[PDB]
């Protein structure tokens, strides 16, 4: 179908990484 | 109130808890301390930790920003009573208008309460010290609880740490400046003379110092009770910050405004006007900058407080880092303090002292009556004493209560021949002389204990040279061979070669009285004087070893290699002083003055060119005869400048002298005479171990360690601020061309927007507020010690170089790394970008719902503003992808990255907290209806990555032109 | 900045603080700073060209359900005209005389390109592929007499000058798109018409449940009986095979309107493929607001 493009996958994917991205920068930041 | 100055010393019993000696008693103290409050005075309440909130939240530049959700939530009330369908649209934007204000508040407060934390902390950093004589045996205490009843023991130099009346008095000085406004000091006595209680001599008073003698006093109010208890800024680099903000607020309010009645004339809907001239306004203003700068300052400042360098004001940090001369003092400060005894010289022969258990026996410890004289005389004079728990340990560490000579010559003494206490007790100290500055000499004739001669010994130390007319007759075997010419050529050459290698030279002197003068019986006094003192029985000299410092002799490396001019001041003679300067790199190699060239190519001193010469030594006492003009071009013509046998007192005539020709000085000083010198200059120093309280109330700095070498670690702390400052102010500046040009393509090329206003302030608050305050905790480069210093009269932190850097080449290449995505995003779903030129009108319209695109289907009015939500969520996106190579370029200024490394924590956490607020903002459930954002594809991450590249790329290769070609068109023009 | 003193020297001949020929390069330097800018911009942009096809888009799921339109262009969805006066209705048949022009029997007598196509709704018509192998693509022709009382072989005012007017429907085209009407369990869909396999059905009702007792009579003029869109026509091919294409119409007259009043009008299309939405109010759907004033 050339008319559907389901966003939930991408929507999954960014989620996860905006978690991680956070995570990581506060395992950065109390590094001290 | 009357204060206890009338009742004598009787009544001073019969007033508090029995005590006028021997110290007061622990119970005594814990019941006083009770009694009433303790010596601190009370400070006035400032405002709570809500107020300094508000000023935040609602302060300035957030005003427009409550307007904004005030009128947003008025046309939302407006549109819900009279019309159906309400359709809540400004109650998002009321929200989102509502939350910027709140987070941008909440980080302008937790950056000022932290600097406010830090810079409390430097209170109780070096308390105040009072010195008491309570029961234990005279000791120091913190000065935040002494009690009433109390004796305590001042000297000159010393603080008054609470109210006083004085019981026994050595004419002390107190200035009275602090409650009269008299500049002159006051002598105090223990009697009772002036009726008011005020103007008296009983008393003394909080806040005021006795300069000269010493007291003992007695305490009679503590804390808020006493005279001063009762009763009762800005910094250049600030001050700079504020009027470069005023700039870019009129600019950007210009151009607000313009954008402002340039929308409504393409029907703009005038709630959405409003909210874009505030969205403009508020995001093309730094208003950052103004909390970074005060963290820029008070971190340096802690900084500096971690390398033993405590600063007053922060007024005093800017200003130490434009340092161009340094008049240090030597003793202490360049060298350790702690000499040790090296090279005597007597009957025609340099010795060694042989300090060490290895006993060479230089003809020591033996019968030779020339060095026993000279022994007894080193040892009858010195004046200090040992502590208790002393006589138990070695020769390698001895407590001593003295100056650093004596203490020295007893080291010595207490090594070779005995005790020392029963040699005291052996010849009577009849009559003292304390040590005078006038002429340096030290006296105390003596006695014999019940007989060794029929002609008593009086003694004489004290500068050779000024005491080579009182003393000539030399001491060989005990004869007294009187004056002889060569004799005084080999004193001389004993002379330079003892001040050659660095030693302060003491002679020695004695006579054979008779008993014409003194009997048996009544002595005679030293007062008034009665005894020949020319042609005296010399002995010989004893000279001095002392080691300069440990991280000395390269800090005056790094003093030379930034173009930092040094000074130094002594009271030595100037061939001891050259040899010091010429130890520790003061005048370093291939300097020499016209003495060295006069005596190399041997032609007299006094018809020398003084052009070749660029090192010079001034003695003290062509110092006070010479005029501003001879002064004002020795200063000027030499380089290596050293000041020898000088009084503090000119060491001020020095210190403006530097200043006419444009020099930032800093002072070095620890007496009380060089109090009018601390606060001429630039920026005084006081020490922090030695030095009394007079000297530390009227300088910028303390040393807390007494080291040289900290004076240059702080000048690179200084120095540091400037560089982190213009780094910060080139990264905030860089994100207003893509806030600004999206508009005007808008207008002038006809296409649809790119750029809305609620990504406008996304931008602003995301890409603006932590990474731009992370420049801030940038290390140093490797070249801030090889610049010259900055003149702060042609110098400022804004160029022409550092605006069309920002705004002219950096800022281009992120307008563009947006509109490619742009043209990406809306050439993939049917909008080719030639098709794009001239379809603004129709786009536009709410009533025409098939807009025709390349491929010839037909688009509904949301169907094509979804995409255009989708064009401005990657505008943004875009935006933040450029803001990080914008970010990495901008932590150096003439290294390159890869020799700088990623040791800032901060900078990291300021990337990831970017891209975590776009991945959220784009791709979370719900921003659909509020923000109007909308998913992106994950292959549309990756358009702004070329120009990111290429921003990079870029810079690096100018700081590679700029590294290997100094001097350079591109130095010139793009270095800012 | 001072004033004279900085705007010319001649004593060391430097305009604004820089002497000429540092002015030249200055200027040299930006001139090629931005010269090599655009060039890159034009460059990635025509690298991106590359990956875009010329018969399909890359994404067509922002058009995926079309909208549907009518064609006399009004300003909010809003008809109101007096019909014995002829300048309130003048802009309204100007209107429809312009978008009729193409449609008109004497512009599709190009038997190579235009083809005849049955008069009775039939399946899709398959021209091939998106693959340029046979050059332009033929379309149906769409005949006008098939609008009858709406066409203007008659009254030339499309009716607003005795009272009823009337409004021509249209589906949006979307690229590659077969409209599939609903099944026929005989419980789907709302309420009650006559079904045909070939026909996306259309039909137009009141909104409120004053408009339902005031709208009076409504006419359909189609393809057929069966009042929608017919499919043998679709999916269009796109502006690039298929110029001079034509999608098929459906006009609708109301012969009873109630006089003075403004009356709101709903028009639905049902299907499979169709749908709708509570943001997009002209998305498979649209209303319409007519008044006639006496
Ligand atoms: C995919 C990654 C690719 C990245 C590519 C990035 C390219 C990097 C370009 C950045 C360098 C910026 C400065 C370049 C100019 C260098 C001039 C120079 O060498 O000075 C010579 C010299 C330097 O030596 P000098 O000046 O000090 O000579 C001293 C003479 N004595 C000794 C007698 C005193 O300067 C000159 O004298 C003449 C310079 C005149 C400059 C005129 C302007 C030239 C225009 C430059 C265009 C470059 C734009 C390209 C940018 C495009 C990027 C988007
Ligand atoms: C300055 C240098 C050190 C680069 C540092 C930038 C960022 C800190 C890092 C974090 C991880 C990197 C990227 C790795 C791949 C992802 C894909 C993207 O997620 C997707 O793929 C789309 C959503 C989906 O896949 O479902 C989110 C951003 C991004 C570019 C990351 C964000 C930015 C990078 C370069
Ligand atoms: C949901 C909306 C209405 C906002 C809700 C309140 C905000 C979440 C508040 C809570 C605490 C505030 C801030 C207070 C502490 C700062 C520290 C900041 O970290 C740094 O400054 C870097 C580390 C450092 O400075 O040492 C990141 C989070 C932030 C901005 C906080 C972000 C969120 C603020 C504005
Ligand atoms: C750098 C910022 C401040 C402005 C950049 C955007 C430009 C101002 C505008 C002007 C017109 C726009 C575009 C409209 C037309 C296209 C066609 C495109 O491809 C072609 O030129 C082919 C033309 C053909 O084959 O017919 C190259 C230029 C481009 C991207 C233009 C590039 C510049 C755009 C985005
Ligand atoms: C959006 C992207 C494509 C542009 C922004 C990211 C930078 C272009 C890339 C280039 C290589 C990356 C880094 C890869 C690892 C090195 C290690 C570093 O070397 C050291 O650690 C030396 C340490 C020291 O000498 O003290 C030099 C910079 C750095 C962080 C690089 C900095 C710049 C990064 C993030
Ligand atoms: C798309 C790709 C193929 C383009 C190629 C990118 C270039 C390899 C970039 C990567 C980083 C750039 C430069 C930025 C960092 C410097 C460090 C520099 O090393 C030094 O320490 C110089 C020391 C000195 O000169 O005193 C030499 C290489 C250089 C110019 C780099 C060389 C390669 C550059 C031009
Ligand atoms: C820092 C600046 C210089 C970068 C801006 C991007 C390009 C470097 C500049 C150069 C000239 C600009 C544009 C000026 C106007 C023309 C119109 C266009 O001519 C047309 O065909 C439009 C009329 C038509 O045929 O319908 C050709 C390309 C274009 C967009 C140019 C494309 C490139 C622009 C945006
Ligand atoms: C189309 O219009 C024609 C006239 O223009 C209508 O034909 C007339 O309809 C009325 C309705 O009662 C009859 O009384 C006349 O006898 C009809 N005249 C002719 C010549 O047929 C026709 O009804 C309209 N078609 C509709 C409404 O579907
Ligand atoms: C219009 O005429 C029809 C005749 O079939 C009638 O049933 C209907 O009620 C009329 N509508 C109005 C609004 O008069
Ligand atoms: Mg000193
Ligand atoms: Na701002
Ligand atoms: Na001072
Ligand atoms: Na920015
Ligand atoms: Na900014």
Redesign the interface.
Known sequence: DPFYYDYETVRNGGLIFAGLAFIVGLLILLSR | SMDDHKLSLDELHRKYGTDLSRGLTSARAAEILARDGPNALTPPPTTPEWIKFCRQLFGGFSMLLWIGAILCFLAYSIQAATEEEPQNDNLYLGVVLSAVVIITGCFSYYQEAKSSKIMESFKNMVPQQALVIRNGEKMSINAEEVVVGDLVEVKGGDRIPADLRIISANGCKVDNSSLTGESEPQTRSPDFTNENPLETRNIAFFSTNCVEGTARGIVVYTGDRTVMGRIAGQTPIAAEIEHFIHIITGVAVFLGVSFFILSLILEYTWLEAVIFLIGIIVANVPEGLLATVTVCLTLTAKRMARKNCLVKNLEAVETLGSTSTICSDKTGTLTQNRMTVAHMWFDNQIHEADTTENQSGVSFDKTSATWLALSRIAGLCNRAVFQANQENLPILKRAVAGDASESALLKCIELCCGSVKEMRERYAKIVEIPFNSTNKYQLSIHKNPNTSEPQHLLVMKGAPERILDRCSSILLHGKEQPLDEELKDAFQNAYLELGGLGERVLGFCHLFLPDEQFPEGFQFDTDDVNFPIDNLCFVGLISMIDPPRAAVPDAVGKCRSAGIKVIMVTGDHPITAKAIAKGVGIISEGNETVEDIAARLNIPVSQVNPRDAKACVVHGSDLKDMTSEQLDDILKYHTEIVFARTSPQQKLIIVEGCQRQGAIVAVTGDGVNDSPALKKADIGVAMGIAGSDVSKQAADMILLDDNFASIVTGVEEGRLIFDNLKKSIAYTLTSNIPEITPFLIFIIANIPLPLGTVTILCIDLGTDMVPAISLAYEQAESDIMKRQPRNPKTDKLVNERLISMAY??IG??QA?GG??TY??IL????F??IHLLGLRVDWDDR????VEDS??????????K??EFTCHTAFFVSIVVVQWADLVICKTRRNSVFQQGMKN??L??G???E??LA??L????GMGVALRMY????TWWFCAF?YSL?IFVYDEVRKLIIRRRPGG?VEK?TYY | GSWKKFIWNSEKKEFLGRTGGSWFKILLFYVIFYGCLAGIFIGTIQVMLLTISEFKPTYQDRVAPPGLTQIPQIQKTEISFRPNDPKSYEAYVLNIVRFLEKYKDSAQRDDMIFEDCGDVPSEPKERGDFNHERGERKVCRFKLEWLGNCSGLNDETYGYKEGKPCIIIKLNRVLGFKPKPPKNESLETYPVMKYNPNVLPVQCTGKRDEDKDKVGNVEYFGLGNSPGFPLQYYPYYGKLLQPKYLQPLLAVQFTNLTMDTEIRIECKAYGENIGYSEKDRFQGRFDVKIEVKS
């Not at chain 2, 998913?935 to 994950?938: G, S, V």
Request: charged share 15%; hydrophobic share 45%.
């Open positions: 002219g080449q281009m290449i563009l509109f490619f043209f990406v050439a993939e779903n049917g080719l970008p009533w025409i719902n098939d491929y010839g289907q037909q688009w509904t009015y949301e169907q094509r979804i995409v924590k901060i990291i956490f990337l990831f907290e891209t975590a991945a959220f784009s791709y979370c459930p998913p992106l594809k994950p070329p290429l068109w023009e």
